[PDB]
Amino acid sequence: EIKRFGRIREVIPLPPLTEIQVESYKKALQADVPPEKRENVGIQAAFKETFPIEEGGLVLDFLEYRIGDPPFSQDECREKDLTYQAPLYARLQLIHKDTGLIKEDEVFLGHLPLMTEDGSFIINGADRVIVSQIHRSPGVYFTPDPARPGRYIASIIPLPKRGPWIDLEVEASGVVTMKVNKRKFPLVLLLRVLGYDQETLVRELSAYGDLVQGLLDEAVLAMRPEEAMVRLFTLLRPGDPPKKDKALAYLFGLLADPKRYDLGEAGRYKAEEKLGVGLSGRTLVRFEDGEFKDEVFLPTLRYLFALTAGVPGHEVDDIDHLGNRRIRTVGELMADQFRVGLARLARGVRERMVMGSPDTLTPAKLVNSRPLEAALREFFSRSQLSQFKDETNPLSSLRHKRRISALGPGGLTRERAGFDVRDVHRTHYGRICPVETPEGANIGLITSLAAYARVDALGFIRTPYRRVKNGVVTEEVVYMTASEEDRYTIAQANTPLEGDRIATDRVVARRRGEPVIVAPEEVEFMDVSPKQVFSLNTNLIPFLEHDDANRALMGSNMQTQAVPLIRAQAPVVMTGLEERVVRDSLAALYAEEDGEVVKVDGTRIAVRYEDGRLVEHPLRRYARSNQGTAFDQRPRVRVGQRVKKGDLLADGPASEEGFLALGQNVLVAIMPFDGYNFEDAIVISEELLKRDFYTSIHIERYEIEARDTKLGPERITRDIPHLSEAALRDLDEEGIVRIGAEVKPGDILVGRTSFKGEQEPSPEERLLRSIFGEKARDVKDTSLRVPPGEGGIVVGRLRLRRGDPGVELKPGVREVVRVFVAQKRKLQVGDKLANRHGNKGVVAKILPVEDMPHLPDGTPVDVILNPLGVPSRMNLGQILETHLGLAGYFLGQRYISPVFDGATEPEIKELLAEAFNLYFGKRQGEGFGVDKREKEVLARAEKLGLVSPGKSPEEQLKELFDLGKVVLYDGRTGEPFEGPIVVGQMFIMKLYHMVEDKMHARSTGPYSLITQQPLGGKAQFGGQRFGEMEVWALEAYGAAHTLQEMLTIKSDDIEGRNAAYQAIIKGEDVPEPSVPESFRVLVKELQALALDVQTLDEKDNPVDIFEGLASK
Amino acid sequence: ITIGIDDAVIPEEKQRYLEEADRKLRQIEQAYEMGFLTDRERYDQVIQLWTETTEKVTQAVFKNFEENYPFNPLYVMAQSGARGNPQQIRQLCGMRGLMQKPSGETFEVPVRSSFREGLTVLEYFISSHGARKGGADTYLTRKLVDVAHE
Amino acid sequence: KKEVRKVRIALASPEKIRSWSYGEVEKPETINYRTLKPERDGLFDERIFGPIKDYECACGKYKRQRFEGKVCERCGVEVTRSIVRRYRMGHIELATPAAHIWFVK
Amino acid sequence: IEIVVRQMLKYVEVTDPGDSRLLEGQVLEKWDVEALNERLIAEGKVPVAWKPLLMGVTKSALSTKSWLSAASFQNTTHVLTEAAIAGKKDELIGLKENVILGRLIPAGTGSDFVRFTQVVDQRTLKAIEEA
Amino acid sequence: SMARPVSIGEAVGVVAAESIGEPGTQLTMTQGLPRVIEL
Amino acid sequence: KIAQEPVSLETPIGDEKDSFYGDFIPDENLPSPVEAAAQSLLSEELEKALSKLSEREAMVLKLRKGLIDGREHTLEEVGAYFGVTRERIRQIENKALRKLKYHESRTRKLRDFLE
Amino acid sequence: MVQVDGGRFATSDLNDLYRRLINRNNRLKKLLAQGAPEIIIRNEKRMLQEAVDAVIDNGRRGSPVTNPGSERPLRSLTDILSGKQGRFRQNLLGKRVDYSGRSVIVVGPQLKLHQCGLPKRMALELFKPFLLKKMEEKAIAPNVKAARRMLERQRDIKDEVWDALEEVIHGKVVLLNRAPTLHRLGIQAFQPVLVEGQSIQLHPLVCEAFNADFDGDQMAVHVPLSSFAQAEARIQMLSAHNLLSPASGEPLAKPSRDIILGL
Amino acid sequence: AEPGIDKLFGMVDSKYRLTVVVAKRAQQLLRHRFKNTVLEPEERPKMRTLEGLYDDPNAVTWAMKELLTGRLFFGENLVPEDRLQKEME
Ligand SMILES: [Mg+2]
Ligand SMILES: [Zn+2]
């Protein structure tokens, strides 16, 4: 019972939502591809560039490279805290060119990290994703000259560390110079080296006006290419003597060497596509038969002269235009740092040749795994494009894999981020979400791929459109880049159609991102859907058209922060993407084929498929996510149920029957409430807690090491010296806590003892033990206890002992013990609630069901929301959702209202009317008229003009109900609220609660070593940061002693904090420090620099701030 | 006090105001094909047209509130100073107005839809240019504390 | 007793630098590789910088408060508070003079 | 604003040193050369001639007389050498100076104007008047 | 803040700096904040 | 294990230039304010406990336990101090203890401090 | 120089700078006594000057001295004073402080202007030394050490000690701070009322000054220890004594949002 | 909280001199465990509690209460410093 709105029916589904991660890393590894037929891209092109090297003859070559098999599964890689990787080998043969010797063998080069099915990696047991990067695409560009208002300059740019930037500028003199590596020189000097004469340079280039006359230098056009090459070498490299063998070697490596200059394969397409020529190879110049042969300089000089002349068909390139920016996906980012570790293995080969026995050296002892291993490990563990996977819920992980970052190595920095790149470019339409982006310093830097957006082979983002020929739409879709998009006139997706033919005489369309009304004969493409413009999360916001984009940004971000719930529901009003999100997130479980279910329990689902196979599917139960949220799958099929392929078998976290279930559907009332909902605060009913709504399961891991101390080995044991039998009840035989015990802060989880480091017990300690007849143990309790504010019941245990099979551990560590604790967290005051429209709020008051505002039939609301959080934030979509939820509440139905193609206001009022007949009709059938309190409300609603005068009480109630409003009684008084009050169902999520966001409180704890400032510990929290702006505030108040306590006694003053603690302990007022410790350290650090620092008093006499301590 | 979608009531003088604006719009395109106007002062006559037409519907929104629905929640919150300003109330009831493109010079076609009737995809995307600008735009105390602390 | 109201900074003469010093650090050693105790003429020596334990010399002959101020006969260590190790300075007596680089560069 | 703008011209450049140790072109604070010149006229000696100076808030803060406060900026070494060479006494007048030292700030309850106020009751005032 | 003669000891220097810098994040709607820094 | 050189306390942590290694290391040797008070309360509460004895009873215990000079004096030195036998000192010591145990069973001041 | 976890030692760069100076100075001494030729003596004297000014200002002149196995320059005495982590910036930039806490904030409209809602657990820790003393005075424990053992080893907080905590709190004030502290009203003093839950309850009339919004904002708590600290926290920092703007003199704690809406 | 705070600001020329007076007087109250109070038993501030109404343990509250009675004298150099505490114990 779920109605779908909308006139637009998408002709194609969303792409494989993780194909930006999966297909990239697959294309780079080419695992299932035979090494004979591999396409010379990615991880093999790194070898075919590094090899073959030769420099006493040596020729190591590249034949095959093969992936190994994972030594460990993904689960035991997460359990062991080891990177999920396979060994990488390669067939390297050594050729002695002077002898003819050949020596083949296969050598270990390094461990290659492998990608999972969903599209992430496991590094040191941690799930980890590699975000895509946006950067400037290579090729040739033409921009207007800043310091010359008349002309434009050209720029040839290749891949980074793959050639230098090249500029072509026309000076005020009129001669055309060329800028390379902070050098300037005329173009003909290089053109002479390229084999051009003045006779050829004129005829094909004469038509652009007087521009050739700025290129002609008769003195340079007179010399041979041989002496022009050396004339070039002297200008840009004026260090060494200009020998002609070095001048040739330089220009060859600079512009002609394919391994030292490789303008991108995408940049070569860009150069070929922009200039209208044809380029074989990725260099600017070749080197055939001994002379240089041009490839790019003549076409790009023609385009520059053409553009400066004003010929049509030539334009300036937009810097942000998404045809001039590209995407570095996972495989490209890895294979780039791969060849870096090969260029460092190259040195590890080159230098190993001058030594040893240069006649016979195996490439086994010529090549080491250390260079490449350390290169890939730096990438997956340190690169800012590789960060902790966000798996708060299935939607979180799907979104994280689709992020596009301008930051990272080779990318931008936040200080030099500026605004140009932070902005929304007109080409983002259909490729980059214009609303989903962080709030804070990373605005516009980190974005999200659009729903229908795909990244092509060259790294450019495309979006589908429907081809239309003569006002008739075709089933043919075409993915076009931003450059190809500017070529056509493209109509909006919501243009009225008479069954696949256009209806209106005025079509809304776009030309280079410009709103233009058009006739059905001028349209050649049409948008596929409104969904293609926004990201996944933004497409999950119903009535998005009625939400201002700023709060809709928050609505997109917070769905990523929603914790999975025990009784998680799909929203009452949906957008139609909720099923596909859980499908592509790989958090649920589906049937591999047609078949029948034969076994169903909480741990496994067994089905017999067509092909006769019997497959049992293990259900992951209460597993810990990176953020501590419970990953839990639950069966959704019965025994004997016959399922089709792709049919749901088990729901993952935050999924209800296969639909994204990020929260709960709660009955909301929009009204103030005694200030408990002041400034975004939220009032909730206790009934939510009774029904376990918004209850989540969170699992935290704890860990303790038993180490080898020079004072003696630490021991995991139940024998803890001075401890009660009660404090050890839940400790098993070997000292670690039992599964199923409830642990509260301070309780022991793993018992441990450490040797004291033999010292005399103090005489007071000796007399103390003599009184109580206790003989001192030689060991102290160092057992792992549960930190404050944390707890739950133990659900997992794990022990890794050195000297036992399968496990190797850190040096000096005898064994490690891990304990897993789970807790059920029900909604409480302080928890953060939110809807998909950007409404935020902290639960401020949990109220008894009796105090809650309720309907005449006794039904109480679940949550009270303040209307004051709406007008200045301009998100009327939450109001439309509440109105639609009111209808579906009494109608007992859910709704699908797509973005920009959802439920109209009249369609909603009709449902509201049909719902009133049910609700009010059932009330008459039970024999109850219109209450006298309701008639009291109906009287005022007429005074202000909310109901029409003259109609009956039932009719006025109906006029309120289709306005979305109802009469509501105050559970505290029985009296009604004086005005009608819009109630309904709203989808509300509970947002994630980071560890540092919980309640902290310190009195006294550890202090740092060098600076004596408060430091967090296992038993105590750290102190709050009292920064300089707070110093100014206390100064502004003139509260000197308050500021003096912060800067001394409460922080780094050793004597002061000890004296103050004792003062409070003995009921004494805390004293002031006679001379603070920061003063003392400053003087001694200055005296260390041989500077006499004199501390003088009122009459200039020396004060000794060291009282008999350092005075001699 | 509560807020429902019908509390963002649209004046019936909005329909008349923007059909007058179209009357004056083609009236300016007419004077552009004749030669009476260059492209610049034609564009400036389009911007002023939508600038004062935007103010027209803003006055229409509040005048309808003041004269017909004095206890409307949106109008009461704004007049009392509880929540909202006339610029925000205008985008809810009247028209969201004239937008600004990444370069800086204002857009010719304004968004005629309010948030209650809903923006189109083009209206929504084009507005994201300026919405992100306000977000990106959104030290001195330290330099002043340094100079004057004594 | 009196309250510091001004702070002057000036150059330090050799005899003034030696006035701050509780001894000359004569050796580059720090702590013994086995005992982990400070070496006798090194950078952590208690015979100059102060005791590591409160009111307890390095050998242990005097290890109570009533002995405060007593320098040990065979230690060379004053029994007093270990807090003096943040405050007591030593010095290095150079063979030939060296220029303070601040006043040079 | 007036409090801050006044700080933008609290320094002066010496034109004629007169009978002081000052030199021509030397920059110092107006409130000092006022306190200097009223000692010189009392001594019968010739006062200092200065011209007003205008500094931005940044440049004004760098030019401060206190060496502790000046050292808290980026060129600590240059500040410290010239201060030790001159034997400069930091008088600890501003708030930043004392915060660096860890000294009670000269404002509010730390002001010389109110800090030394005493409080007594009648009994102890009579018991002490017997002294 | 008290609508009365200021007390001696009031750190009006810091207070002035806070009063001026606090709205620095509200100078948007024109020269604006760069003008203030220029001054 | 001994071959490795020490780590620098000034080893930078993270790309941020505002933290060294030693900024996060706790001081394992300096006593906390709670530890410093506990040893003082222990010395105060033991003095108050010993004040329930005769001065010889208390002086014997303070000599036997090292509260005077830091070394446990055997029965011979304490008997030489007081001019009595090793056995007479042992009886004084044992009687002084069970008097302390009696007062401790009634006040319970010293029951904690006991780890 | 101290050993950290794992047994490995951690030391300060200054030690190796001193150590390189002591080594070279001692070599110069036993070269002068051996009567070495001048070319040798001049070399040790150069290395001596290069050792001293590396202790002073490593890197200034010449290549900075580094440890084996790293390119990081050793921290000199000048780097200890100069820079952002230097001693002249340490006090100015602020510090971590004892007797402080943090929590998400909640509206708590029943509060009086001079009041805040403090979670009982947070109060029990913020005022723990005070609680130990009053647990002794009220015979709840024999002495302060026995009171600490009760709180630390029990997890069962009798109504007897909640009354004790209520008595130490009486009259006292805590500081509430929301970042960014833009003016002095970013820090205000309230009298704590013990509250059920994990959230600080903040009076709604002070939300303007703090720029507080109940959408997840967190605030810090600080307890001023001494009587001077209490006196100035109560006299000149109490929220109910700072009603008018220091910038303009206009009311800053004034009716807002629902309050205006109802009136 | 602090009733009569406006009257307390009037007794002094500077609000900060009031804080010094309240704080210093409160310190004397703690040192002598409220024996040196100038308040009569019926104007002693109390604390509403079960098991009876005890005296308010807040010394800052007493000091403000005493100051409102005029029974205290405050000023600079009003009496020698050493002779003050020596004669108050
Ligand atoms: Mg906020
Ligand atoms: Zn000794």
Give keywords.
part of a larger assembly, 8 chains, A: 1112 residues, alpha+beta, Dna-directed Rna Polymerase Ii 140kd Polypeptide, Chain: B, Domain 6, Dna-directed Rna Polymerase Ii 140kd Polypeptide, Chain: B, domain 3, 7 domains, seven-stranded mixed sheet, 25 helices, 59 strands, 24% strand, globular, F: 115 residues, mainly alpha, 50% helix, elongated, binds magnesium ion, binds zinc ion
> How many structurally independent domains of chain H?
1
Per CATH, which architecture of chain H?
Answer: Alpha-Beta Complex
CATH topology of chain H: Eukaryotic RPB6 RNA polymerase subunit
Beta-strand percent range of chain H: 5-15%
Gap from first CA to last CA of chain A: 92 Å
Most residues in contact, chain pair and counts: A-G, 91 and 89 residues
Shape of chain H: globular
Helix share bin of chain A: 10-25%
Which H/E pattern describes the elements of chain H? Answer: HHEEHEH
Gyration radius of chain A, rounded: 37 Å
**How is the biggest beta sheet of chain H arranged?**
2 strands, antiparallel
PDB class: transferase/dna
Keywords: RNA polymerase, Transferase-DNA complex
Entry title: Thermus aquaticus delta1.1-sigmaA holoenzyme/downstream-fork promoter complex with an open clamp
Chain A: DNA-directed RNA polymerase subunit beta
Description:
The structure is cut from a larger assembly and holds 1 copy of chain A (1112 residues), 5 copies of chain B, 1 copy of chain F (115 residues) and 1 copy of chain H (89 residues). Chain A has 1112 residues and is of the alpha+beta class. In chain A, strands 20, 21, 22, 23, 24, 25 and 26 form a 7-stranded mixed β-sheet that branches. Chain A has a 6-stranded mixed beta barrel with strand order 39-53-40-52-51-56. In chain A, strands 9-10-11-12-13 form a 5-stranded antiparallel β-sheet. Chain A is globular, with a radius of gyration of 37 Å. Chain B has one domain: RNA polymerase Rpb1 funnel domain (Topoisomerase I, Chain A, domain 4), CATH 1.10.132.30. Chain B is mainly α and 150 residues long. Chain B has helices at 13-34, 39-68, 73-80, 86-93, 121-137, 140-148. Chains A and G meet through strand 41, strand 52, strand 57, strand 58 and helix 22 of A and helix 3, strand 3, strand 4, helix 5 and helix 6 of G. Strand 58 of chain A pairs antiparallel with strand 3 (94-97) of chain G. Zinc ion (ZN) binds next to loops of chain C. Zinc ion binds next to loops of chain C.
